[PDB]
Amino acid sequence: DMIHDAQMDYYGTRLATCSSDRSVKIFDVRNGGQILIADLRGHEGPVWQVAWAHPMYGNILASCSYDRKVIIWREENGTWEKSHEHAGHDSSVNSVCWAPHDYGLILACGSSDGAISLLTYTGEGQWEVKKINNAHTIGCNAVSWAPAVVPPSGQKPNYIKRFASGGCDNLIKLWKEEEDGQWKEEQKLEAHSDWVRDVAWAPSIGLPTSTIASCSQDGRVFIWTCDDASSNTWSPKLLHKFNDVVWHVSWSITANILAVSGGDNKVTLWKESVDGQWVCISDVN
């Protein structure tokens, strides 16, 4: 009937769709032609978000549902069997995304009972679930990692370690890591008035000014950007203010055009001008 989130695969290949009928359909797009391949079904609740993995670790695609469980099925030799299954959450899952392509196979999924998840695959498939509780006041609703931030020998290059999450209590920013057991998040930023819907970080195209967009239920779209690297500055900029609530908010990779999806069942493309103010490009549909 009504779909929730439908993200593409790699280089415009398949299109894993998710609706409210507990059906994770993986449709193929060949020269603009939509064609279904398989229908992964095995959840008691409605499917929410879905994110595909990188092509270096085969062909994995994780999808969240409302049955307090996370399914991660593979795709090889026409067999879309469910590989790993993580059910460490207490309530339903809202958002579920993966890390970078160079981070192996790390996926972060947020729950609704004030907790999250972080499945890190090892050398075989033993996902070490290291989660807890006490997150936001109502739970999580947004989960998206930031850009692949880089760190002189001749082996595996370093990056920035793993540390990313997101709540719904009018607080959505990045996080910091360390050199101990896991990571110690440190990035407090509050500028919203109601429940935060979606919050996707913008991918950096080589520049150090990393930005992060967010959308709440009040109708405002904040764009929090940093001044420099390793600086204590998280000033947010209001892009637009609508009368209705916003759903999701995606960003492009070339010009980093913000795709504001929400309001009156219409998507709008926002792009930063030379003066610094965000203006609407055109209207979708």
Binding site: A99, P100, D102, Y103, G104, A115, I116, L118, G123, K130, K131, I132, N133, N134, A135, H136, W145, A146, A148, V149, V150, P151, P152, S153, G154, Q155, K156, P157, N158, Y159, I160, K161, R162, F163, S165, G167, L171, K173, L174, W175, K176, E177, E178, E179, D180, G181, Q182, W183, K184, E185, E186, Q187, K188, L189, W201, A229, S230, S231, N232, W234
Partner: protein, 418 residues
């Protein structure tokens, strides 16, 4: 200010015999270091932007590169000459219950490649230490009393240890994040300079007990009752070295959080970086490559000697180790400028072992070596030191170097000690 060095080097040469040739190179290092200190005081007193000091700054750099090249030469050629005398005498029986420490001590005695590669690391760590100077105590932080003081002031962290970002939520204090990033950068700089104990003490004073415990776990297990060679007081080390290496590799692979902390973890483990290597130096890159090669060789030896268990290899590691030609090609692709630099080329040739060929090429090219006035003297001094140490220099090359030195002395009007 540098013109006295031409006489001081001759006086130092004449004071030393062939049996004290390494005390001569240590006196050459000290003459250069005394002059570098004078020139550094001159350059630091100069008002920024006067073109008059560009030559003095180029001279400071030239003599600093000379000083560290003498230090490298003394370290490598002392080892090579000692090794060539000891190859007649050692059958060592490996004990069936040797600790990791005892195995590695036996490797460093037996293997000249591992030992000379570590001397290159120690040399490059000494340069980075000289550059840090006394400035370790003047680091002003915004936090005065507690880790992430500003984030704590702003309550949001559920776990007080270090697992909240992987558990849930992501909000604390930007000031605490900046303080942690600065501490990680300082720890990485200390590890690159060569002060592991100082970095551990600084981490313990700041409050990073877990970070200090993770950094101290780089040494292997060495029991004093089992290993009879290096019998000490108590047993030090850990058996989860492979697990710690796999965890550090996974942390370095993960991105979008703490670039400084990930770089410090990769440097402590034995991997590489990406954005940190663009602003690094050629000597630091060569030292990191040598350390990575030594770590790969040690891992291969431990795997071949049936020292590590099968379950310890959790993640896949790069088993292929680089060689001298590979390291040279990497340094070239990194900084062809430093590779073509005369002092760095002589240092690389002395570290590799092909000093005679380089000297012959430099002598044949002189018949654009006439531009650098100090390179012709440095090559002659190196040839004289090699001839005093062993009988491997070319007679024609030595005669050409002597003729060039005599011509330079006659041109500079200082033939009173030729």
């Amino acid at each position: 200010a540098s013109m006295s060095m031409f006489s001081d080097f001759l006086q130092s040469f004449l004071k030393h015999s062939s049996s004290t040739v390494f005390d001569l190179v240590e006196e050459y290092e000290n003459i250069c270091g005394s002059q570098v200190n004078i020139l550094s005081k001159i350059v630091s007193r100069a008002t920024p932007g006067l073109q008059k000091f560009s030559k003095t700054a180029s001279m400071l750099w030239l003599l600093q590169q000379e000083m560290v090249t003498w230090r490298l030469l003394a370290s490598l050629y002392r080892d090579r000459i000692q090794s060539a005398l000891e190859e007649e005498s050692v059958f060592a029986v490996t004990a069936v219950n040797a600790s990791e420490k005892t195995v590695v001590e036996a490797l460093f005695q037996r293997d000249s490649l591992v030992r000379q590669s570590q001397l290159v690391v120690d040399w490059l760590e000494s340069i980075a230490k000289d550059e840090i100077g006394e400035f370790s105590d003047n680091i002003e932080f915004y936090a005065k009393s507690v880790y992430w003081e500003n984030t704590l002031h702003t309550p949001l962290v559920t776990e007080l240890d270090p697992d909240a970002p992987i558990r849930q939520k992501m909000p604390l204090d930007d000031l605490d994040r900046e303080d942690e990033v600065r501490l990680l950068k300082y720890l990485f700089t200390l590890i690159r300079a060569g002060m592991t104990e100082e970095a551990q003490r600084l981490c313990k004073r700041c409050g990073q007990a877990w970070r200090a415990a993770t950094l101290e776990g780089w040494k292997l297990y060495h029991d004093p009752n089992v290993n009879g060679g290096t019998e000490l007081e108590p047993v030090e080390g850990n058996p989860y070295r492979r697990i710690w290496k796999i965890s550090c590799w996974r942390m370095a692979e993960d991105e979008l959080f703490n670039r400084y902390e990930r770089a410090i973890y990769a440097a402590l483990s034995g991997n590489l970086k990406q954005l940190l290597p663009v602003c690094d130096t050629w000597e630091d890159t060569v030292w990191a490559y040598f350390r990575v090669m030594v770590d790969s060789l040690v891992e291969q030896e431990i795997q071949t000697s049936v020292a590590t268990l099968d379950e310890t290899e959790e993640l896949p590691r790069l088993g292929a180790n680089w060689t001298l030609e590979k390291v040279f090609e990497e340094l070239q692709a990194t900084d062809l400028e430093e590779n073509q630099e005369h002092y760095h080329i002589v240092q690389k040739f002395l570290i590799l072992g092909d000093i005679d060929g380089l000297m012959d090429e430099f002598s044949k090219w002189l018949s654009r070596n006439n531009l650098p006035g100090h390179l012709l003297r440095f090559m002659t001094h190196l040839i004289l030191f090699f001839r005093t140490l062993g009988l491997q220099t070319k007679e024609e090359v030595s005669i050409e170097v002597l003729k060039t030195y005599i011509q330079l002395l006659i041109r500079e009007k200082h033939t009173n000690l030729i």
